[PDB]
Write a protein that binds this ligand. Sequence first.
Ligand SMILES: Nc1nc2c(ncn2[C@@H]2O[C@H](COP(=O)(O)OP(=O)(O)O)[C@@H](O)[C@H]2O)c(=O)[nH]1
Length: 260
Amino acid sequence: MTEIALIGNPNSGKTSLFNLITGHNQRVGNWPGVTVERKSGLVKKNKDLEIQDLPGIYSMSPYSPEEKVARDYLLSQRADSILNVVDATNLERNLYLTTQLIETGIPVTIALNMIDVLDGQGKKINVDKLSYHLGVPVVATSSLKQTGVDQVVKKAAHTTTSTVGDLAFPIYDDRLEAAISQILEVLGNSVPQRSARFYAIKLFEQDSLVEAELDLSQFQRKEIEDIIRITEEIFTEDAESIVINERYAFIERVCQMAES
Ligand SMILES: Nc1nc2c(ncn2[C@@H]2O[C@H](COP(=O)(O)OP(=O)(O)O)[C@@H](O)[C@H]2O)c(=O)[nH]1
């Protein structure tokens, strides 16, 4: 009755964590007409929770079936919650996907995974600080030591589209935030309220799939074009690089607050 999308970078420990949560309740097939494996399963300790395992990705670009699948699932609102598996030892790179996942509008809970490995390296991540700055709940997890796994699944199960009333998105440079606002005003009700920021940001980036699979009017197209052009002049960069740099700056800022 509650659906949780499990997703993260490759080699973040998604499968290990998935197998510990779901155990001998797994169903393994594939996505329609494509060789990407599709795993699903019910939570051992609560059969009313279903985990939808998604493919491991580094971002939500449109140039591969793995990412196109992850994107299409999250935008459809089939999941009530995102359980984002983050490799704690490679935190800065991992959070690039997280910023995009938070923007989908489905609530994110973070499984800060492989925490035992971080203990063996001498680094320390302040979990409360990390949680306050990303604006999402965070639980430390180890698939090896089997710690914090029931805690993070429980938190995911109670942090859903039904329970979270007011979502806090990552704030970027105010000049980029103006553009996103202007893109939202023009889009109107052409996009769902929940995932609106995702679409606005992706149209700014000039993403092929969103542009090519959205029935906008011609005036809406021309308005967004000017928002993009004008913004590029303010920054003296192309639209794609503006967003990339602003994500990495926000991530850099966050890690410096939480890292040792
Ligand atoms: N030390 C430690 N290693 C882990 C943990 N979880 C996974 N691994 C290791 O990390 C690698 C990736 O695991 P896997 O679940 O396949 O990651 P995925 O690519 O995200 O599915 C494997 O070689 C595991 O042995 C953990 O909690 N602690």
